[PDB]
Structures are given as C-alpha cells and as structure tokens.
Design a binder for these strands. Structure first.
Ligand SMILES: [Mg+2]
Ligand SMILES: [Mg+2]
Ligand SMILES: [Mg+2]
Ligand SMILES: [Mg+2]
Ligand SMILES: [Mg+2]
Ligand SMILES: [Mg+2]
Ligand SMILES: [Mg+2]
Ligand SMILES: [Mg+2]
Ligand SMILES: [Mg+2]
Ligand SMILES: [Mg+2]
Ligand SMILES: [Mg+2]
Ligand SMILES: [Mg+2]
Ligand SMILES: [Mg+2]
Ligand SMILES: [Mg+2]
Ligand SMILES: [Mg+2]
Ligand SMILES: [Mg+2]
Ligand SMILES: [Mg+2]
Ligand SMILES: [Mg+2]
Ligand SMILES: [Mg+2]
Ligand SMILES: [Mg+2]
Ligand SMILES: [Mg+2]
Ligand SMILES: [Mg+2]
Ligand SMILES: [Mg+2]
Ligand SMILES: [Mg+2]
Ligand SMILES: [Mg+2]
Ligand SMILES: [Mg+2]
Ligand SMILES: [Mg+2]
Ligand SMILES: [Mg+2]
Ligand SMILES: [Mg+2]
Ligand SMILES: [Mg+2]
Ligand SMILES: [Mg+2]
Ligand SMILES: [Mg+2]
Ligand SMILES: [Mg+2]
Ligand SMILES: [Mg+2]
Ligand SMILES: [Mg+2]
Ligand SMILES: [Mg+2]
Ligand SMILES: [Mg+2]
Ligand SMILES: [Mg+2]
Ligand SMILES: [Mg+2]
Ligand SMILES: [Mg+2]
Ligand SMILES: [Mg+2]
Ligand SMILES: [Mg+2]
Ligand SMILES: [Mg+2]
Ligand SMILES: [Mg+2]
Ligand SMILES: [Mg+2]
Ligand SMILES: [Mg+2]
Ligand SMILES: [Mg+2]
Ligand SMILES: [Mg+2]
Ligand SMILES: [Mg+2]
Ligand SMILES: [Mg+2]
Ligand SMILES: [Mg+2]
Ligand SMILES: [Mg+2]
Ligand SMILES: [Mg+2]
Ligand SMILES: [Mg+2]
Ligand SMILES: [Mg+2]
Ligand SMILES: [Mg+2]
Ligand SMILES: [Mg+2]
Lengths: 93, 46, 271
RNA sequence: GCUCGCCGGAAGACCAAGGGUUCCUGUCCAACGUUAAUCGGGGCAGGGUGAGUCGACCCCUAAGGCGAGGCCGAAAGGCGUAGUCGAUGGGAAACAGGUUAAUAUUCCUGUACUUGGUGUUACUGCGAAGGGGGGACGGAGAAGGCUAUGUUGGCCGGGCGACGGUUGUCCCGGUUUAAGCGUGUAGGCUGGUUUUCCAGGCAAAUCCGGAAAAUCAAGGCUGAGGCGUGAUGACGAGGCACUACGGUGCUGAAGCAACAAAUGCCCUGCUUCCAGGAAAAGCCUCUAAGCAUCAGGUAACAUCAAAUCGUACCCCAAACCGACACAGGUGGUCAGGUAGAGAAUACCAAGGCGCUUGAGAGAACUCGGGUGAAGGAACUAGGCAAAAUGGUGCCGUAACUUCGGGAGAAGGCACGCUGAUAUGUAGGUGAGGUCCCUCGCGGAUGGAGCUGAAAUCAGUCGAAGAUACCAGCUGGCUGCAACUGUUUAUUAAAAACACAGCACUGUGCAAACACGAAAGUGGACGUAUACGGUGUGACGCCUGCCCGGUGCCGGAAGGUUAAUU
RNA sequence: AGGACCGAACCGACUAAUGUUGAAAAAUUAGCGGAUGACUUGUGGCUGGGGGUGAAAGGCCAAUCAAACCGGGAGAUAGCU
C-alpha cells in the first residue's frame, strides 16, 4: 500500500496537445505530467484515488529537456515524465 | 583518411573517467590540481 | 610412417609429414580436458620475456598423469591419441575400477595392452616401478627427480634413460644429453622408450607451418642498428666483433650453469 | 505539373557505434548557406520518443582488472589467495493487419507465448557450498531435401488505341496472407530393457564409470520443409461519393497451378585433414548434514506480477572521424528484371537523386577525350605515355625441368539469325490412373502437363556475328633473390627483412635466458626428438689451408697479488 | 589437397598524368599486387619514454620520434646575432 502523501505528490499536471486530445477521444486515455521518480504502480493508484476512476494499464516515458538560448548563454530545460494512463471505458474523466 | 580520434564512450570513461582517476594517488592529485584551478568540469564523465 | 608430399605447389615441395593411422580420429576425453590460453611470451608485467612466441592454433590441455601412483590395479589401453601440447603421443587407459587416465604412450604400446604400477608390477613396457626394483641396464622413461613428485626426465618423443649403476640409496642414470646423474633409488620410472620416435624426421616445408605452431620470426642481430643490438651497424655487411646475445653476453661457448646446490648429484657433464 | 537526365550490390532500405533535437508544425530571412532565396540541418515558438516478449538492466563467465588476509618492498607502493568485477561469447517469452504532421514487434484490432508469487485440491522423499551428464565449440569439401524469390500459364477486372494493322497465339493490372497450434516428413545419430557385483567419481548416491547374466529385437533423441488450422478474418485491382486539391469514407473480383531456384535453412549434420579446434551458469540427475504425517517436490485449475532505463532524427553521411554543408575514412544485414559464369558489366524495377553561382562567347594556352594521309621507335635516359591483345568450344604447343611444371607456351578454326532433324530433341521435373502394405507426409507402376541444353544439315543479312560494356600483348638472351610473404604511415617495395632447411653453442629443470631493489612471472602445466642465443638461408655439387693476433674453453706446477692479521 | 591458378568484395600501393595558396596537411583518374591465408575485419584488453613494440626502415608509440607529450628546476647557459 502506497502512502497518502506519495500519491498526493506523484501527479503534477495534465498534458495538453493534439495527440493528448486524440488519445482521450479515440482510446479513452488521459496524458499526464507525473513525478520524475513516479513508477507505473504509484501513478495507477494515484489516478484511481485522486480522480476517482478505474485504470487497467499505464504507459510512461521521460521527455528530455530542450537546449535553449537566452541572451547568448546556454541553458537546458529539465527532463520530465509523461504518462499515458488508460481507463476501462466506464468512467469518463 | 582514418584520423587519430575514434570515439568510444566506454573506452573514454575507462581511460579518463572519475573512477579511473580516483583509483590512483596520481589521479587523485590530478583531481586536486583541477579543483584548485577551479575547473567547471573535473573529468570527461560529465 | 614418414610421408613426403608431391610438389604440386612451392609451399608443399619440401613438406615431410608424420602420419599415424593408429591415432584416434574423434574428440578427446572431455573430463580430462582443461583450457590453456596463450601468453605471447609475456609475463605478469606484460613485457616480452621470451622472444619469438605468438599466434598458432587454439589448444586444449590434456591432464596427463606423470605420477603413476595407482598401485596394484591393472589397466587396459583404450586408444592412442594425438596431443597438441607435446611431441609424444598419449594413451587413454581404463583401470579395473572404472577410472580413466591419460599417460605417455611408450614405443610398442597398442590398444588393449595391460599396464600396471607398483612394487609388485612386472618388468614390461608401460609399467611404473621404483628404480630400486628395476634391474641395472634397463631402458626407462618418465623418470622422477624426487620420490612421489612425478616424471620429469625423458618425456619427449623417442626419449629414454638407462639405469647405469645402483649403489646404496642412489641410482646412476645416463640421460639423453649424455650427462650422468644420480637420483634416489625410490624415484619411479616407466619401462621402455617414449613412442613417436619418427617425430624428428618431419620437415615443416614452409614458414606458415612454423607460424601454425606459435613461433614468430627471428631477426638477426647483424640486420639491425647498433642502438638495439651489439651486432648492429655497418655500411653493407660488416660484423667485426665477437658474437653475443642481445644483452651483451658471449653466445658461442661460454658456460652459464651456476647451481652449486645441485652440483653434488652430477657425476659427469654431458660432453 | 509535364518532359529530360543520373544511381540502382546504391547515390535504395535497415541495424550497431558516434552525435544529441538536427525529427514535425507555424512563423522570420538581420547573421549563417561560397550567388539569390519566398527555401534550409539557419532564428524563434509549440509539438513529438507509450514495451512482461526489442535492447539495456539481470544470471554466467573470457582476455584482463581489482583484491580481505598473505608474500615482498626506504616511503609511495609491487604481486597474489579466497573472492569480486569485466562481452566482443552462453542464458525465458509476439506475430499479422490498422493508425500519427511527427512513435510503434511499444498505440488499436485479432491471434499467441514465457517466467515468477500465490491459493485450492491429487499423489508423493524432499533438501547443497558436493558427484555426474549437458551446455561445449576447428579448417576445408560434397551431395541430397527444401524455402525465400523469380518466371510462365490459368483466373479475375479493365482495354479495343493520335499514324498502316490490332476481338487476338492481343495490351495493362492484380492473383497476398504471419506468429502460434496439430502432423513428426526428406534426413542425422544412437541397439533397447531388467536384474547381480565393484580397489573409481576427496564421503554418499538409486546417479555417472566398470564387470557379468538374461532377453527383446526395434526403442529413444534430433529434425528443414510441407499439409491442416490460425483465416466465413485481414488485405486486395477498381469503382462509388467528397475534395480545403492534401487526402477521406463505403464497397471490393480473382486470390490457383507448373517450372526454375539461392551464398539462406535441414546442417552445432555428413565426409575428410592436421595446425587438433573457450569458460561458467541456466538445465537434467544423484545423494550429505537436516527434516522427517510438518516443510519441500510433480501435476491440474484459478488469480496476481513482470519493475526501471532507452526508443525522436542522421547513421557508409551536410547530423559520426577529417577546423568546412570537405571528391577522404567508417563494422553488420536486405539483395528484383533482361543479358551475363558472376555480388563483374550495360540498361532498368522498387526507391532515391540532377551534386547551392548562373548567362553568353566559341581566341592563345592548360586539362580530359575522339579521328588522322605516308612513314612506324627515326622519340627518349628508357617504347614514359599511348596504341594493341582480350571470350567460349575444339585442334595444336618447344628448350629446359625439382617430373608438379614450363603452358592460356606459341599458333589456328568455328561463333549472328531462320528452318529442319525434333508440330520441342538428349535430359530435368512430374499429375492422373493401377496394384500392394507393418495406412500414412507410404513402396512399385505409370506417364498428362511443364521445363529444356548442345550438335548437325539447309537457308539468309551485313564491311564486320566473342559486333556494345566487359575482356591476357607475345617471344629470345642475361644479373639478383629459391619460392607465398614483410618493409621506410606521408619521395626508396628492392638485390633489403622474413622464410622452410643447415650449423655452432648454452641449458638436467627451482633449466639456461628475460622482466623484476624483491615477492614473483614468462620459458612451460614444456623436460635434451625440449627450450634459448648466434650466424647462414629452398634444392643440387660442395665447403680447402692458418690457433701467430683478439676472443672463448680447459689446466694449475711456478711467479705476482686484495680485504684480513 | 594446395602460404595452388584467373578474377569482384575486401586488404594494399608498382607506373603515369592531374592536383601542389589542392576537393584532400598524402588525394583523384586510368592502369597495378594479394584475394582459404604468415589473410582480412569488429569489440574489449595488455606492454610507457633510455622505456615499449619492431618479418629491422632508426620504423612506429594520437598530423610530434637518433629518445613522445604536459608541467616543473627556469629568467638553464649563449666569448654569438
Ligand atoms: Mg500496453
Ligand atoms: Mg627464439
Ligand atoms: Mg631461424
Ligand atoms: Mg638497416
Ligand atoms: Mg652498443
Ligand atoms: Mg663492405
Ligand atoms: Mg674488415
Ligand atoms: Mg518539379
Ligand atoms: Mg536547435
Ligand atoms: Mg526538417
Ligand atoms: Mg534579401
Ligand atoms: Mg546569401
Ligand atoms: Mg530548423
Ligand atoms: Mg519502456
Ligand atoms: Mg580473473
Ligand atoms: Mg592487504
Ligand atoms: Mg593484484
Ligand atoms: Mg560477475
Ligand atoms: Mg553482449
Ligand atoms: Mg519515422
Ligand atoms: Mg516456393
Ligand atoms: Mg560465399
Ligand atoms: Mg526509429
Ligand atoms: Mg555542396
Ligand atoms: Mg563527404
Ligand atoms: Mg573498411
Ligand atoms: Mg556495378
Ligand atoms: Mg557545386
Ligand atoms: Mg575548345
Ligand atoms: Mg586536347
Ligand atoms: Mg586514338
Ligand atoms: Mg569521322
Ligand atoms: Mg597516322
Ligand atoms: Mg594509314
Ligand atoms: Mg609496321
Ligand atoms: Mg633511338
Ligand atoms: Mg635522338
Ligand atoms: Mg605503359
Ligand atoms: Mg589503351
Ligand atoms: Mg651485368
Ligand atoms: Mg624474393
Ligand atoms: Mg610477392
Ligand atoms: Mg615512403
Ligand atoms: Mg612507393
Ligand atoms: Mg621458475
Ligand atoms: Mg644472408
Ligand atoms: Mg646468399
Ligand atoms: Mg593463392
Ligand atoms: Mg598470382
Ligand atoms: Mg604497408
Ligand atoms: Mg586506383
Ligand atoms: Mg587474384
Ligand atoms: Mg641507416
Ligand atoms: Mg605520428
Ligand atoms: Mg637525451
Ligand atoms: Mg636553476
Ligand atoms: Mg632564456
């Protein structure tokens, strides 16, 4: 059993794009920004408890930060984790 | 023509990496020298 | 069976091969095998300490029993096999208790032959006995230096040692080199001569044959520069100096034995 | 958009390394791009990488690294045991179709597979840091059986032709289907089983090894492919309707046969040769302490779990290594047609490109090519360069020779197309039907169909039939090195180095020798038929005289002589 | 069978021309040698500077070799310019 504060901290934000909206419509899959250390099980439990839905599978990937330039210096955005969490076609989050 | 630098990450790390330097007192003295000079990048590791 | 090759190609013209039909044609006996990787003549410092070694065919080591201390149990010769690790052939022998061992194959040995070791063993080729119980004048091979240590003398193909004298706790041996040496009478030896006496009649015929055996080319000292050999230098072919090793020691006639510990056991030098 | 041109064993496609956002979309053309630029691998912003089966991670080890104690060393440290790391090697599992602007064996559809925690029940001797089997291994060569794949015919849909002809022995297109599961085939290997005993496997073993009786004689393991299912599914030419001109939705015929055939598979096989060809674990099996109606094992069924990291893009290059958007370098895999021996070569397919300055002119001269009167090496240091020879089959071929060669010596003849032999031959492959059986992927028969050289004769066109690309110049005398090899990366490839062979010499094993203040290590798990050093350099005929000098070896009478005293 | 023969890949580098402020700090084009072996190639590993390695050219040891590179003694010394 994963404790309460872990579940409250793993989920960070929902992803928004054409691919995200298409996933939601076609395959009932919401796309999330999750904690860099969050595992598939923690993500699944957190979606089951904070959003009050049912999950059958979660797919994760790590996005690499882009190298950018501001005023001639060099900078790199942080890496972050993206989750494709599917629902079992009966919740409509 | 074939030139002198033929990169290989494993060989680079084994030759000049942090753990290779730390394994010998001469390598530790290399690290101490580079810290004293104030290098932003001690070894090839990062 | 010494067979020369027909001169169909220049590298085959002078090839003379030793082919033994009796030798086994399959794979060796696996439980008696062990890997022996190659060194290139390099030591644990990584430096070349013996020149002219490198390459050659991969080889497995066959555990050969040089001690022959299974006493009182008769054994039968199963087959004779080629051994890449030595000039001589070896024989697979099966003991009455189902134990299998490799031994040096002596001359005249064949499949089915009976061998035995011990004080009570008979005076037949292949039998191991203490030299105390071997008559003076007998030709033997696989001779021990110390009792119970294992055969160390007369092991190469066609080699043997004769028992010249027996006085007290020591026997006198005439080695292949001609040296007369004293060894304790309790050291064991095997009756007969080492087989494969035609091994020295083979002719390699080509350089690649020497490379197959893991030998690298030898460069003459006079062909190089003075910075890396005493013999080096000269405008054209010049020598003008007494021959020496690459390290400056005279290499034609100077003696190098210096072992006062074992001097007492040497009756006469080889001469 | 329509023509034209180029590559097509690559200039196409895909992995690994290396790089890191170069990928897609919108927008901008200051700088960057050897010109312009509306374009870009350039600026700016947003988007994009979805795994129980792919890889890493993980289990196991190689070379090698490190190394508790230990041995050694002024210090720093060197080496090494037990151990522990280290792939370029061994070890479980997923395929086909659909989908995005950009991901897919990862998402969706359909159909599978593997290991582990459990739990219930049926039966039950389980258990290791030990024993045993297995994993487990070379080169070359040859045949058969196959497949990928190709071609032709049949079938299905369409067509009836810009200029003579084209309802046909005519044109175009398609004719596709996986993993898994069932079958255990061509073929490979191995006799099977049960009792009795045992100096072996560091102890035990019911296991492995050995010995002996009995008896049956076919048992076991392996194994491409095919066949059936998977699949009444999917896909599928084309039409039908939109079109924002990108593409979208519906529907969808036939979906077979014969022949040819790999360098791929059966094959880690078979045959043969000497230079004699990893390890360990996973796996199977046996017992020990121990536990002994518990625990644990085998099985059926059900549920649960398979985490983490990588996945974009380039990848024989504009994105990697070369300071460059650089005629250079970069490991592995895929491998269509015609002709061809071919992965050569020419033209093409799929696919990808026209190389990031153009427009004129038509001087010398330079570069890269084409042709050349008569002569034909007169050139020149030198036939440098160029010109020439060039294939297959058959005939024929000298001195010399180590009897293998020399030799493709030299030289010569034939070669296209059409017909016939023979409505397509010698052959290859092979259905139907017929008989049989220890019945199935079977033995004998049988030949439909398909495919199919080479030769001969006859005729015929051209100046020329190996017509293009492709593709030896030949002979005579002689120096040197026997030969295949090696070498001054970047002015020297040779007569130089190496070589097999020869000789001298050292070396008795704790070997000589070499690396080491040492411990040790190589030599070598080798033992004088072996190992090191030196010189000579296949083979044939041979290798003469000198020990005065220098060196080396042996000797110890006499002289000289150190520390010491 | 073969350090066998012809000949692509692949490894090399005998000749000529071009190039020589190059397309290239060693290449291109036409020819050329080996091409089952003493072969070639990928990955990883070991040998260190009076040392290594060398089928031996004083060759090679990161475009550097009759003694690598980096730092230090160091402002070496220079009857010379
Ligand atoms: Mg999924
Ligand atoms: Mg030698
Ligand atoms: Mg020699
Ligand atoms: Mg020289
Ligand atoms: Mg000298
Ligand atoms: Mg001279
Ligand atoms: Mg002289
Ligand atoms: Mg266009
Ligand atoms: Mg950028
Ligand atoms: Mg782009
Ligand atoms: Mg402008
Ligand atoms: Mg511009
Ligand atoms: Mg861009
Ligand atoms: Mg993943
Ligand atoms: Mg080790
Ligand atoms: Mg210690
Ligand atoms: Mg150590
Ligand atoms: Mg390990
Ligand atoms: Mg690996
Ligand atoms: Mg893509
Ligand atoms: Mg087929
Ligand atoms: Mg091949
Ligand atoms: Mg990709
Ligand atoms: Mg360009
Ligand atoms: Mg380029
Ligand atoms: Mg290459
Ligand atoms: Mg071509
Ligand atoms: Mg250009
Ligand atoms: Mg002109
Ligand atoms: Mg011209
Ligand atoms: Mg001409
Ligand atoms: Mg003309
Ligand atoms: Mg003329
Ligand atoms: Mg003329
Ligand atoms: Mg003429
Ligand atoms: Mg003249
Ligand atoms: Mg003249
Ligand atoms: Mg010429
Ligand atoms: Mg020409
Ligand atoms: Mg002359
Ligand atoms: Mg030569
Ligand atoms: Mg040659
Ligand atoms: Mg040169
Ligand atoms: Mg040259
Ligand atoms: Mg020793
Ligand atoms: Mg010579
Ligand atoms: Mg000579
Ligand atoms: Mg050859
Ligand atoms: Mg040749
Ligand atoms: Mg070279
Ligand atoms: Mg060339
Ligand atoms: Mg060739
Ligand atoms: Mg010189
Ligand atoms: Mg250099
Ligand atoms: Mg010096
Ligand atoms: Mg000073
Ligand atoms: Mg100064």
């Amino acid at each position: 059993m994963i404790r309460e504060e872990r579940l409250l901290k793993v989920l960070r934000a929902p992803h928004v794009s054409e691919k995200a909206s298409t996933a939601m419509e076609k395959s009932n899959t919401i796309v999330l920004k999750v904690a860099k250390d969050a595992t598939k099980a923690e993500i699944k439990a957190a979606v089951q408890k904070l959003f009050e839905v049912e999950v059958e599978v979660v797919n994760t990937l790590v996005v690499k930060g882009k190298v950018k330039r501001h005023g001639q210096r060099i900078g790199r955005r942080s890496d972050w984790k993206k989750a494709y969490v599917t629902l079992k076609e009966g919740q409509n989050l | 023509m074939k030139r002198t630098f033929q990169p290989s990450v494993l060989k680079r790390n084994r030759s000049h990496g942090f753990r290779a330097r730390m394994a010998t007192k001469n390598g530790r003295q290399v690290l101490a020298r580079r810290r004293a000079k104030g290098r932003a990048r001690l070894t090839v590791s990062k | 069976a010494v067979v020369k090759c027909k001169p169909t190609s220049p590298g085959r013209r002078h090839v003379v091969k030793v082919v033994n039909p009796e030798l086994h044609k399959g794979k060796p006996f696996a439980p008696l095998l062990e890997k022996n990787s190659k060194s290139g003549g390099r030591n644990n410092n990584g430096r070349i300490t013996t020149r002219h070694i490198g390459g050659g065919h991969k080889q497995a080591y066959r555990i050969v029993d040089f001690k022959r201390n299974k006493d009182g149990i008769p054994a039968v010769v199963e087959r004779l096999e080629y051994d890449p690790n030595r000039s001589a052939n070896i024989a697979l022998v099966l003991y009455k208790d189902g134990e299998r061992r490799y031994i040096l194959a002596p001359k005249g040995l064949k499949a089915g032959d009976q061998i035995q070791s011990g004080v009570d063993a008979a005076i037949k080729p292949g039998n191991t006995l203490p030299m105390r119980n071997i008559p003076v004048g007998s030709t033997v091979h696989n001779v021990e230096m110390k009792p119970g240590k294992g055969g160390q003398l007369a092991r190469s193909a066609g080699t043997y040692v004769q028992i010249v004298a027996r006085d007290g706790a020591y026997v006198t041996l005439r080695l292949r080199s001609g040296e007369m040496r004293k060894v304790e009478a309790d050291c064991r030896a095997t009756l007969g001569e080492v087989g494969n006496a035609e091994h020295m009649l083979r002719v390699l015929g080509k350089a690649g044959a020497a490379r197959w055996r893991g030998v690298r080319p030898t460069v003459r000292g006079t062909a190089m520069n003075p910075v890396d050999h005493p013999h080096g230098g000269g405008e054209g072919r010049n020598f003008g100096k007494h021959p020496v090793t690459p390290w400056g020691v005279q290499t034609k006639g100077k003696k190098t034995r210096s072992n006062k510990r074992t001097d007492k056991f040497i009756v006469r030098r080889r001469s």
